[PDB]
RNA sequence: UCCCCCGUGCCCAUAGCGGCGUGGAACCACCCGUUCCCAUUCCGAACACGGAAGUGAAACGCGCCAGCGCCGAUGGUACUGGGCGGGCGACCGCCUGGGAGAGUAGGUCGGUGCGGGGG
RNA sequence: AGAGCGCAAGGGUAGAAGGGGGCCUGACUGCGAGGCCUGCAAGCCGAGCAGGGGCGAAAGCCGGGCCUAGUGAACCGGUGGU
RNA sequence: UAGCUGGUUCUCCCCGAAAUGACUUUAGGGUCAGCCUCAGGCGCUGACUGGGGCCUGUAGAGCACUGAUAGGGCUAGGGGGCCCACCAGCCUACCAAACCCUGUCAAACUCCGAAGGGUCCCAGGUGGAGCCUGGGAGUGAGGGCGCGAGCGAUAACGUCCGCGUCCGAGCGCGGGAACAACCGAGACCGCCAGCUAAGGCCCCCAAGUCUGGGCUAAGUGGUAAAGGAUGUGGCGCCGCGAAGACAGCCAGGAGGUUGGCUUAGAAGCAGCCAUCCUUUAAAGAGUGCGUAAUAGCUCACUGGUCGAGUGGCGCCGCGCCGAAAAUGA
């Protein structure tokens, strides 16, 4: 399984609490936060839930 | 202002909603005396170590796990099977 | 006009009316037709107003059909009252009509006849409509 | 027309699925669930006798031994139109203990 | 008559639509590919068709095949076709709607009266070897209140029937005037 | 191993209707006697107890047909998570995924294991 | 299954809960596994256990009624007993 | 006495709420749990999500229950007449049980039934997750926007619930001209350092009078409708036409006739029906004006001249009339 890699692009303040629970499920702190990640449909869906606050790249 | 003849009603009366539904499903261990289906008419007919009471309510007789069944020309079935 | 004389509920809640006609844009009846453009109630008062203006303009005319039917209870509270204490009154007996629904159609008329007629008849209603012929409408029952 | 599942009032435990018809008596003892049967004994369909009531007697008791060969002890006489005139083979002495 | 055809791939209709191609499906007995045409000549030609006339779709695949229409789902909103179905023909007795041309000016007609257009298009079982064009319907002797139905219509030698036959194909109805302002009462 | 039937059960009508053709050699069913066991708010119809002659219509088992009945793809659309504009509202639009019934094609009068008898 | 299933309706039912007869009296006694429900309190469900009882050839059902409404903690006192 | 008003004093550090559910002589107070806090204990549990198993009747939609429902056809009975009795016939631009077809409607209708939520199972997920006992609280007028329903009138900066959030406590920040809640975005402090969000770049005020092509003539932009018009751009449709057309001009523009029917009269021409035939290249049972009705004028239609395009129907974008209230724009 390749490695996933994502940042945080769009502020958490004023959006659903579930999506923010995903943002905790990743570890996404403040704005501009490059994150090293592992691939799995679980975390994949977790991140797909925030497909707008987050920059996507599958660094291998 | 002037507020002439108005009126009243007769409908400020509601029935205290009683929590009804199905509690346990296939995948859950239910051990002897656990209600798992709340209903009024036979929405869920008993069976394999399943039980019914004085108000059409399914529960657990065994320490077994639930599962379901469909038998059209008979009804809807619940069978709580355990282990050999 | 027209409605039930005794249905099921004196009152019923307003509801939400978004769109899609639910069903009814073809024919099987008239040869020209009038079709709505907005999702609103049409009042049976306005309905019969159209029926009038229609058979009115063209006298001795043939037969016109109404696909719609005003069967919606409007809740009209008494005048000069106060908030709460009840509801409205079984007034404004109307029908739920959304865009693309054939309100009403003519058959046996003349070209320009059906034109000017349905033109005015539609000009009456609380909206604006489409004057349509009969060709594509074929099939769908 | 005698369904009611009298067999549901026999779903209690262990069956004896049978039927009577003019010439033959179909006295069968059946393990259920999988519906896997076991013990049959008939009128002249077992090549025994010709009067159902006598056959019954003998048959049940023959059937007794059959049951008593396969570790069988108790079931329940299965029929809705049974009426129960015993046929005092009544598969009671006939293995089961019955009545 | 003649019309173009092209094979649909599986691209979302939204594009095919928004451009100018009219999306649809065709089939026969078991076959069921997906296709598309072009609104303008499709519209123009279909007027001279419906399930009354037979159509031909030539295709850049090496094969040109004719069909009849069937089931046309629409937009509802703004009223216009947005999809079509085309049943491929055969030669084995098929069932669909033959047009009935109204013919006759009797007593219901003339002396007021309006024809009751019930079934121009009627369900019949005709062998696709034969093609009933414009089945005449005798109005020549009918008066208001009465009607016409059943086997009374034209039953061409190469066409069989299977509806009721009871179903009233047409009738004559009374006109209106200021006499319904008396009804207004 | 399998054929025909009887007892039986499972799928839940694509298993049901109807029309039709066929079997009684073991069966099944009518039939048969109403003394005996036995029962009917009345009927030996029903349940019966005792059974020779007959029957295959009716009961049913198998077969052929769709007329009725049941199923219904596949295209497209409705409505909709989630995301984003536009309108005074009434309300309309786009992407991303989710995906009906309506109906057209067409499907279908059966699927099947335990036990028993004859061959 | 549109009948009926006391009463309002919902849900449900002719593989009975409906309607007919026979013996009866489990509107049982001492307990209650474990669950519904939930702010507390009150309400809801019941296996099994043991005493004995009724019907059933039996297998077996019975701790009131097809269910959801028909209800009032406690303080006080009546009454019979321990 | 005071369930009420009011005051309630130094510094910093850490976390951080509720403005509900139940019951109350209860409604602007209260006790119970919920949401916060500290101590100690228990360890990947928790939010979240992937797969799988099952519970679900809202939307839609359909019409099989049920009501309603237009329209036709059929048809019990019934309106009525002709017309008899052992009793029946028969007929209708009548009423209507039911059924068939034509479409149709619904929160308390439901054959189908999503999106979705729910919960168990395995999996990951280290976070002011979570569980468990224990002391301290406060909180129970909340409000806006968002969609989903009620109510109101499909009014209210109206109230009523639900999921969702911002305020409150974020009147600390930047857009929004100014504005708790619209957009953007979580402030330990310093900085005369770099990017960037929302909006924005002609100058306020920081940055393109950049680039390239479309629309409009109204200050539209710079906030209004049904509706209206030879406004302007662009698309499409059906004739007319080099056999000769749009338009202009010349001319013929006719006869039965005063069509019949009405009517004081109705003569193409105030009105019902109609719904022709002929002399001809062409001329109507007429299109307007006019008449007391005739008269006349007149368009239609067809040639003479002509010389190149013309007439109509629908669409899309932007506009214009529609468009008036009060200190000064």
Curated annotation (Swiss-Prot), chain A:
A GO molecular function annotation here is: structural constituent of ribosome
What UniProt keywords are attached to this protein's entry?
A: Ribonucleoprotein, Ribosomal protein
The Gene Ontology biological process terms listed for this entry are: translation
Q: Among the entry's GO cellular component annotations, what is one?
A: cytosolic large ribosomal subunit
Q: Which domain of life is it from?
A: Bacteria
Q: Give one Pfam family, short name only.
A: Ribosomal_L30
Which NCBIfam families does the protein's record reference?
Answer: rpmD_bact
HAMAP family tied to this protein: Ribosomal_uL30_B
Q: Which family does it belong to?
A: Belongs to the universal ribosomal protein uL30 family.
Quaternary context: Part of the 50S ribosomal subunit.
Q: What is the protein name given in its UniProt record? A: Large ribosomal subunit protein uL30
Q: Which organism is it from?
A: Thermus thermophilus (strain ATCC BAA-163 / DSM 7039 / HB27)
UniProtKB/Swiss-Prot annotation, chain B:
Q: Which UniProt keywords apply?
A: Ribonucleoprotein, Ribosomal protein
Q: Name one GO biological process term.
A: translation
Q: Which domain of life is it from?
A: Bacteria
Q: Where is this region: Disordered?
A: 1-20
Offer one Pfam family short name for this entry. Answer: Ribosomal_L27
GO function terms (MF aspect): structural constituent of ribosome
Q: Name one GO cellular component term.
A: cytosolic large ribosomal subunit
Work out whether the entry's keyword set contains Ribonucleoprotein: yes
* SUPFAM superfamilies in alphabetical order: Ribosomal L27 protein-like
Family the UniProt entry places it in: Belongs to the bacterial ribosomal protein bL27 family.
What NCBIfam families has UniProt attached to this entry?
L27
Record's PANTHER family? Answer: LARGE RIBOSOMAL SUBUNIT PROTEIN BL27M (PTHR15893:SF0), RIBOSOMAL PROTEIN L27 (PTHR15893)
- Which HAMAP family did the record assign? Ribosomal_bL27
Q: Can you say what this protein is called?
A: Large ribosomal subunit protein bL27
Origin organism is: Thermus thermophilus (strain ATCC BAA-163 / DSM 7039 / HB27)
Gene designation per UniProt: rpmA
UniProtKB/Swiss-Prot annotation, chain C:
Q: What organism is recorded for this protein? A: Thermus thermophilus (strain ATCC BAA-163 / DSM 7039 / HB27)
Ribosomal protein found in the keyword field:
yes
What Gene Ontology terms for biological process does this UniProt record contain? translation
Q: Which gene encodes it?
A: rplP
Family matches, as InterPro entries: Ribosomal_uL16, Ribosomal_uL16_bact-type, Ribosomal_uL16_dom, Ribosomal_uL16_sf
Known function:
Binds 23S rRNA and is also seen to make contacts with the A and possibly P site tRNAs.
Member of which family? Belongs to the universal ribosomal protein uL16 family.
CDD domains in the record: Ribosomal_L16_L10e
According to UniProt, the name of this protein is: Large ribosomal subunit protein uL16
Q: Which Pfam families match?
A: Ribosomal_L16
Q: Provide any one GO MF term from the record.
A: rRNA binding
Q: Which GO terms describe its cellular component?
A: cytosolic large ribosomal subunit
Look up keyword Calcium and say if it applies: no
Gene3D superfamilies linked to this entry: Ribosomal protein L10e/L16
Could you list this entry's UniProt keywords, alphabetically sorted: Ribonucleoprotein, Ribosomal protein, RNA-binding, rRNA-binding, tRNA-binding
Subunit details: Part of the 50S ribosomal subunit.
Curated annotation (Swiss-Prot), chain E:
Q: A single GO CC term, please?
A: cytosolic large ribosomal subunit
A Pfam family for this UniProt protein? Ribosomal_TL5_C
Matches recorded under SUPFAM superfamilies: Ribosomal protein L25-like (SSF50715)
This chain's protein is named: Large ribosomal subunit protein bL25
Spell out the molecular function terms from Gene Ontology: 5S rRNA binding; structural constituent of ribosome
Query: What PANTHER family does the entry give?
Result: RIBOSOMAL PROTEIN L25/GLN-TRNA SYNTHETASE, ANTI-CODON-BINDING DOMAIN-CONTAINING PROTEIN, RIBOSOMAL PROTEIN L25_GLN-TRNA SYNTHETASE, ANTI-CODON-BINDING DOMAIN-CONTAINING PROTEIN
Return one Gene Ontology term, BP aspect: translation
**Would you identify the family this protein belongs to, as annotated?**
Belongs to the bacterial ribosomal protein bL25 family. CTC subfamily.
Q: Which UniProt keywords apply?
A: Ribonucleoprotein, Ribosomal protein, RNA-binding, rRNA-binding
Organismal lineage: Bacteria, Thermotogati, Deinococcota, Deinococci, Thermales
Give the protein's biological function.
This is one of the proteins that binds to the 5S RNA in the ribosome where it forms part of the central protuberance.
**Which InterPro entries has this protein been placed in?**
Rbsml_bL25/Gln-tRNA_synth_N, Ribosomal_bL25/Gln-tRNA_synth, Ribosomal_bL25_b-dom, Ribosomal_bL25_C, Ribosomal_bL25_long, Ribosomal_L25_dom, Ribosomal_uL5_bac-type
Q: How does it assemble?
A: Part of the 50S ribosomal subunit; part of the 5S rRNA/L5/L18/L25 subcomplex. Contacts the 5S rRNA. Binds to the 5S rRNA independently of L5 and L18.
């Amino acid at each position: 399984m390749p490695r996933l890699k994502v940042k945080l692009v769009k502020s958490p303040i004023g959006y659903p609490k579930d999506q923010k629970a995903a943002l905790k499920a990743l570890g996404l702190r403040r704005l501009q936060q490059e994150r090293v990640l592992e691939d799995t449909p679980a975390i994949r869906g977790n991140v797909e839930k925030v497909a707008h606050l987050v920059r996507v790249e599958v660094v291998e | 202002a002037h507020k002439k003849g108005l009126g009243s009603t007769r409908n400020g009366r509601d029935s205290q909603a009683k929590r009804l539904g199905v509690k346990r499903y296939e995948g859950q261990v239910v051990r002897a005396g656990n209600i798992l289906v709340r209903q009024r008419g036979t929405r869920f007919k008993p069976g394999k170590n399943v039980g019914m009471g004085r108000d059409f309510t399914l529960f657990a007789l065994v320490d077994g796990v639930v599962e379901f069944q469909d038998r059209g020309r008979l009804g809807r079935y619940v069978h709580v099977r355990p282990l050999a | 006009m027209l409605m039930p004389r005794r249905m099921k509920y004196r009152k019923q809640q307003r509801g939400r009316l978004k769109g899609a006609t639910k069903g009814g844009d073809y024919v099987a009846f008239g040869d020209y037709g009038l079709v709505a453009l907005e999702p609103a109630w049409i009042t049976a008062q306005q309905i019969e107003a159209a029926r009038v203006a229609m058979v009115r303009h063209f006298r001795r005319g043939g037969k016109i059909f109404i696909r719609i039917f005003p069967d919606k209870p409007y809740t009209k509270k008494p005048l000069e009252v106060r908030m709460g204490k009840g509801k409205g009154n079984v007034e404004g007996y109307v029908a739920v009509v959304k865009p693309g629904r054939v309100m009403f159609e003519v058959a046996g008329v003349t070209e320009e006849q059906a034109m000017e007629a349905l033109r005015i008849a539609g000009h009456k209603l609380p909206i604006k409509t489409k004057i349509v012929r009969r060709d594509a409408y074929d099939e769908a029952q | 027309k005698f369904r009611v599942r009298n067999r549901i009032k026999r779903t209690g435990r262990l069956r004896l699925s049978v039927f009577r018809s003019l010439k033959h008596i179909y006295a069968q003892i059946i393990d259920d669930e999988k519906g896997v049967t076991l013990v049959s004994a008939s009128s002249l369909a077992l090549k025994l006798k010709g009067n159902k009531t006598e056959v019954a007697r003998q048959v049940g008791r023959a059937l007794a031994e059959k049951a008593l060969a396969l570790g069988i002890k108790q079931v329940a006489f299965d029929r809705g139109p049974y009426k129960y005139h015993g046929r005092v083979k009544a598969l009671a002495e006939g293995a089961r203990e019955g009545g | 008559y003649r019309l173009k055809a092209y094979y649909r791939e599986g691209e979302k209709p939204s594009a095919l639509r928004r451009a100018g191609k009219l999306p649809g499906v065709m089939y026969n007995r078991h076959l069921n590919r997906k296709v598309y045409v072009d609104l303008v000549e499709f519209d123009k030609v279909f007027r001279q068709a419906s399930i009354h006339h037979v159509i031909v779709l030539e295709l850049p695949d090496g094969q040109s095949l004719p069909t009849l229409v069937r089931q046309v789902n629409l937009d509802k909103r703004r009223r216009r076709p947005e999809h079509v179905d085309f049943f491929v023909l055969s030669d084995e007795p098929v069932e669909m709607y033959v047009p009935l041309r109204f013919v006759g000016t009797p007593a219901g007609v003339r002396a007021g009266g309006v024809l009751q257009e019930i079934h121009r298009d009627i369900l019949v079982k005709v062998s696709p070897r034969n093609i009933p064009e414009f089945i005449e319907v005798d109005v020549s002797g009918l008066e208001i209140g009465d009607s016409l139905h059943a086997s009374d219509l034209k039953l061409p030698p190469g066409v069989e029937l299977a509806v009721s036959p009871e179903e009233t194909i047409a009738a004559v109805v009374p006109p209106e005037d200021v006499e319904k302002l008396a009804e207004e009462a």
